[PDB]
Ligand SMILES: C[C@@H](C(=O)N1CCOCC1)N1CC[C@H](NS(=O)(=O)c2cc3ccc(Cl)cc3s2)C1=O
């Protein structure tokens with residue numbers, strides 16, 4: 001995350017972090033329930049064996065809420081394509097259930113029509129992660145969050161050198177120095193409505209980080225609600 | 235009109251049926267007696283920041 005603020009105690013409890021063999025983060029996720037994590041399909045090609053960590057806000061100290069979980073099954077969208085990042089979505093089933101507590105809780109899955117007409121027409125969403133703090137910088141040891149405006153679809157299409165499919169949306173700023181970045185991919189995009197937070201997107205891709213005339217591109221979760229429901233039944 | 239006027243007074247999901255508003259809630263909440271508010275069924279309901 002470029003810019004934004006630190007998540008304070010209890011503020012981003014649905015954050016998951018995918019960690020490699022060396023206990024290093026390479027992507028994010030969203031806690032959907034005690035057995036399931038939402039992430040990006042493209043993240044799966046970034047490590048041979050990985051685990052999932054929840055309840056962590058500072059990777060340099062022990063806070064008391066941290067828990068590591070092994071993955072039982074990977075469910076990747078079969079229509080995912082590396083050339084365009086279309087259908088960039090996957091669900092992970094964990095071997096043991098997540099025990100909810102301070103800093104460990106799920107985000108809500110919305111219904112499609114209400115989310116599209118009411119949530120995605122709000123001024124902003126919230127993105128979060130342990131990714132780079134500057135395009136060429138190193139990964140953050142602190143969990144960060146950032147408020148990002150929804151961007152007009154036509155403007156987004158004009159600004160992009162790469163195709164924006166019906167399965168993607170845009171968010172962020174034209175020139176202001178605030179955006180998601182490398183390592184945040186697969187992480188939560190959520191929208192607040194009357195003090196309840198609903199999943200609205202998955203951190204997907206971007207031409208650099210916080211570049212002028214460029215936006216952040218997110219998987220459109222609302223196009224995948226029946227798909228997500230099927231995956232969570234097996 | 236209806237769901238377009240302040241979310242039909244619903245806490246969460248709003249749906250229009252035959253010139254009338256119908257409210258509903260995310261999984262883990264039950265609709266209150268007034269047919270509008272959403273009440274958490276148990277500890278750590280979805281979408282809430284944690285405080286204790
Ligand atoms: C243009 C895109 C890319 O390589 N594509 C190829 C496949 O088709 C989609 C685009 N790209 C180039 C570099 C970038 N990698 S990144 O720095 O890890 C990254 C930056 C960034 C910014 C905002 C968001 Cl929301 C996500 C990401 S993540 C990235 O995703």
Ligand SMILES: [Ca+2]
Nearest residue numbers: 058061062063
């Ligand atoms: Ca820690």
